[PDB]
Design a protein around this nucleic acid. Structure first.
Ligand SMILES: CC(C)[C@H](N)C(=O)NS(=O)(=O)NC[C@H]1O[C@@H](n2cnc3c(N)ncnc32)[C@H](O)[C@@H]1O
Ligand SMILES: [Zn+2]
Ligand SMILES: [Zn+2]
Length: 862
RNA sequence: GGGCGGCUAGCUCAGCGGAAGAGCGCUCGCCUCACACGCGAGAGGUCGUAGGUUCAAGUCCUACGCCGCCCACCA
């Protein structure tokens, strides 16, 4: 230890960080010690980490460390997700376009430049986690697209397909013409946008009118029906007729369908299964063949589509589409409208729809496999308000498009016969094998589905791929049911649920026993932090500024009840300052046991007191940990250390140490040890350094959690008396306007036994000597247990003392009032605890006793 | 159209059945021999509104007001 005046994290954290880095706390399946597993949500290989991750891992670590030094096999599996679509963009964008030109460099040369990036990003994400003191079993650092993990999927899929649950069909997909790939519902965002609702109307079989309000004119040629509410007979007895469609000679049928909102626009809507979910939905509800007018390039084309219209853009198609309607006489009511435009969450551009042959996943059945457990009580949720939010998500899911046209992910394992047009999917038992001859036409000429899987598909496969489950390992046998899953609600659906499935399905069990959802950190402005919003702060920028233990402590302190966390540097200071205080407290004890000269070894009230108040702490804090409530423990320990050890104990011991009392210096050393234990999970670095310098022990991390020892009742009530006498005098001087150091003689009344026995402390702390004889005239301070009378010797600020005391009375009588009322209240005396009542009765007894004391003094004073 | 979270001291946030709390800021004193990233003494809240349940309600029930999320197929 170097013991300067102030603590410099930079002289400490980096070394310990490296020590822990190069020598991970490797997990042992055969440890024969109860395990504790936590799967680290693998950060996306997109850039660096941000304060969000920090809160996420910092929370995890503190759990690992606690359990570890609590006696378990702390297994925390680290890893990083390739992100798929995400990373894709990142490289494609910035790096490439900016770098020079994304301009297709081949499906190969591109995959190169991506891994290169995967290295930088993946490398950085690790430094960061290391430097934040992540005690992660880096010996098992898994990467979604590493050999061992790629197998977990290629197998998982195969076992799905041949199980039926994974099919291939034309169900329509949300397609982004920017990234040229399909997305999932959860991957597409819909954000209101100013548009133009057009009401078009057209001919009818025999008669003549039908009016329709559509946001997209182009999708008319692809119409297949006019939908009309089933009960809106209203302006609807043209139900069952036909309808030339604007510009065409095509005759669509007017049908009824429950999804028609009679009150929106004209009580009837156009129908286009080939270009929209609602329509496609109703379309198949009455069986109507799909029909495209616009392709994947987002350009017009097709049967119906009119000449001269087929060609250019999808939007520059509606421009002329409208004109060719009004100026042709089919347009009627054009008007503004706030449309719920759907866009690509990761590129912006608005999606589109299309029927395409894709890989889907019968969620309906799976979801039930899971709900089976949840219902039984298999999994526990921290806020607990998420159980329902989870269960309800499953309660109504839709088959998920697993395939993707990205160049990143796992190239799905399906082979298509260039002769029989049949799919060949490796069987589970030989899953690793590549079919070579179509098991249909028996032909050799095969072709593999060059699609790719959904990043979320591999990720949902984690509490298994990290434990080598593509196989049947011992790690997996030793500790599969993770004990606590830590993550922020932002991915409760596309991450947690997904896993709960692949988990409850590929093992008859829960991937984890408890899901701990924490809030999100967000820029001071209140909005979520993410590379997306462009509002991210590198956690290291903060470590460098306040220090890693600080950052860790703030973040945990604030992660109360799954609530979010608004960025507020003030809290970082709060933390740094607390590090420094803890540090100083140690510096004191080290510099004290310096050249100490033992003159005696006598138990002191202060000693007995801190040992007791410590047992209290140890109990309380453990329980808070045993409730995953770190945020609270974080402040319960702040309290203990700062208000009970530094503010009172250390100071109370200063004298005894000058007097060469070994029993005290001993206690200081022993108590400080435990505190360094308690604080370790949150602040590992500083807390280790100190413990080393204090006990010579090299790895606090491996030490055992403290056990609550004593609990001296009287001793605590005794020392309290002292605190009061001390603070009484302190206040008296304050009010009197006397400087701190000013020597003073005062007189005590009441539970004074404590002050008398431990006189030197009282003297040292108050800077006052005791008076044998109660002074005639004097300034008075009334405490709950003791009363102080300060002789009128000297120049004193009586006005202040007066004011201050005139005000205590105002309050003391006010309390007496409340008490009186309660005691004399109906139902309180009777229907209320035989304790909370006799106490309220005692509060009154002494609220008066004090009021009188002041009153009398207050008047007595000239 | 559904659910959910928030609404407590000037600021940022805890507390959720029995006498209103913390950090910072502020007022007054202190370079008191671990710490000025500090020490001591204070000021400052009818806990968003309206109702109830309860002997007892920031703390539970019920509407509502704003703020923000999530899930939704009003074309
Ligand atoms: C399979 C998933 C783990 C996926 N690879 C993924 O979520 N990758 S990530 O980079 O977004 N890391 C997300 C994890 O970090 C948490 N997180 C991300 N942003 C924040 C934030 N602003 N506040 C609090 N927590 C946040 C997520 O809860 C998740 O555990
Ligand atoms: Zn896109
Ligand atoms: Zn074949």
């Amino acid at each position: 230890m170097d013991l300067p005046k102030a603590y410099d994290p930079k002289s400490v954290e980096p070394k310990w960080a490296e020590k822990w880095a190069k020598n991970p706390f490797v997990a042992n399946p055969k440890s024969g010690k109860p395990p504790f597993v936590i799967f680290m949500p693998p950060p996306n290989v997109t850039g660096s980490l941000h304060m969000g991750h920090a809160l996420d891992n910092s929370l995890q670590d503190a759990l690992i460390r606690y359990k570890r030094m609590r006696g378990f096999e702390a297994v925390w599996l680290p890893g990083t997700d390739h992100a798929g679509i995400a990373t894709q963009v990142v490289v494609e964008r910035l790096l490439l376009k900016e770098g020079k030109t994304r301009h297709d460099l081949g499906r190969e040369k591109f995959l190169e430049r991506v891994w290169q990036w995967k290295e930088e990003s993946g490398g950085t994400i690790l430094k960061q986690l290391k430097r934040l003191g992540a005690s992660a079993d880096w010996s098992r650092e898994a990467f979604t697209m590493d050999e061992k993990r790629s197998r977990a999927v290629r197998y998982a899929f195969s076992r799905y397909y041949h199980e039926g649950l994974a099919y291939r069909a034309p169900r329509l997909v949300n397609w982004c013409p920017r990234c040229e790939t399909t997305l999932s519902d959860l991957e597409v965002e819909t954000e209101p946008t100013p548009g133009k609702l057009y009401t078009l109307r057209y001919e009818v079989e025999g008669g003549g009118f039908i009016e329709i309000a559509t946001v997209r004119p182009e999708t008319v040629f692809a119409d297949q029906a006019i939908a009309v509410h089933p009960e809106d007979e209203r302006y609807r007895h043209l139900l069952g007729k036909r309808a030339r469609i604007p510009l065409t000679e095509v005759w669509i049928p007017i049908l009824a369908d429950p999804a028609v909102e009679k009150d929106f626009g004209t009580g009837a809507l156009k129908v286009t299964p080939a270009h929209d979910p609602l329509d496609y939905e109703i379309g198949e509800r009455h069986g109507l063949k799909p029909v495209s007018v616009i392709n994947l390039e987002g350009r017009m084309e097709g049967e119906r589509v009119p000449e001269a219209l087929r060609g250019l853009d999808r939007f520059e198609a509606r421009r002329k589409a409208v004109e060719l309607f009004r100026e042709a006489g089919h347009l009627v009511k054009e008007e503004d409208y706030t449309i719920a435009l759907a866009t690509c969450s990761r590129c912006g551009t608005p999606i589109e729809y299309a029927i395409f042959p894709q890989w889907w996943l019968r969620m309906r059945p799976l979801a039930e496999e899971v709900l089976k457990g949840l219902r039984r009580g298999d999994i526990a949720f921290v806020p607990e308000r998420w159980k329902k939010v989870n269960m309800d998500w499953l309660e109504n899911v839709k088959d998920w498009n697993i395939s993707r046209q990205l160049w990143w992910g796992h190239q799905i394992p399906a082979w298509y016969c260039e002769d029989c047009q049949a799919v060949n999917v490796p069987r589970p038992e030989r899953y690793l094998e590549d079919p070579t001859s179509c098991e249909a036409c028996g032909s050799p000429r095969l072709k593999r589905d060059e699609d790719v899987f959904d990043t979320w598909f591999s990720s949902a496969l984690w509490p298994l791929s990290t434990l080598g489950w593509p196989e049947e390992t011992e790690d997996l046998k030793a500790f599969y049911p993770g004990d606590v899953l830590v993550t922020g609600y932002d991915i409760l659906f596309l991450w947690v649920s997904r896993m709960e499935v692949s988990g409850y399905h590929f093992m008859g069990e829960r991937p984890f026993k408890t899901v701990l959802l924490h809030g999100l950190v967000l820029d001071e402005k209140g909005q979520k932090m993410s590379k997306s919003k462009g509002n991210v702060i590198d956690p290291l920028e903060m470590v460098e500024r306040y220090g890693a233990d600080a950052l860790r402590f703030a973040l945990i302190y604030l992660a109360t009840g799954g609530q979010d966390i608004r960025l507020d540097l003030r809290w970082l200071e709060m933390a740094r300052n607390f590090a420094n205080k803890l540090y100083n407290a140690a510096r004191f004890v080290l510099l004290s046991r310096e050249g100490f000269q033992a003159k005696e070894d006598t138990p002191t009230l202060a000693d007995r007191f801190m040992r007791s108040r410590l047992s209290r702490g140890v109990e309380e804090i453990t329980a808070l940990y045993e409730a995953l409530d770190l945020a609270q423990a974080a402040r319960e320990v702040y309290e203990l250390v700062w208000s009970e050890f530094c503010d009172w104990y250390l100071e109370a011991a200063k004298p005894a140490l000058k007097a060469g009392n070994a029993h005290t210096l001993r206690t200081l050393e022993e108590v400080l040890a435990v505190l360094l234990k308690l604080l370790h999970p949150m602040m590992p670095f500083l807390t280790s350094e100190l413990y080393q310098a204090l006990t010579g022990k090299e790895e606090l991390a491996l030490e055992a959690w403290p056990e609550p020892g004593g609990r001296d009742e009287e001793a605590e009530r005794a020392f309290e008396a002292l605190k009061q006498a001390v603070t009484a005098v302190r206040a008296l001087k304050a009010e009197a306007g006397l400087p701190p150091a000013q020597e003073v003689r005062v007189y005590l009344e009441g539970e004074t036994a404590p002050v008398e026995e431990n006189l030197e402390v009282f003297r040292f702390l108050s800077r006052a000597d005791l008076l044998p004889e109660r002074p005639a005239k004097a300034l008075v301070k009334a405490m709950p247990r003791v009363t102080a009378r300060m002789p009128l010797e000297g120049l004193l600020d009586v006005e202040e003392w007066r004011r201050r005391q005139e005000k205590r009375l105002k309050e003391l009588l006010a309390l007496a009032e409340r008490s009186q009322r309660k005691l004399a209240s109906p139902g309180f005396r009777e229907k209320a605890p035989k304790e909370v009542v006799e106490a309220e009765e005692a509060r009154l007894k002494e609220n008066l006793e004090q009021a009188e004391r002041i009153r009398e003094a207050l008047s007595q004073i000239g």
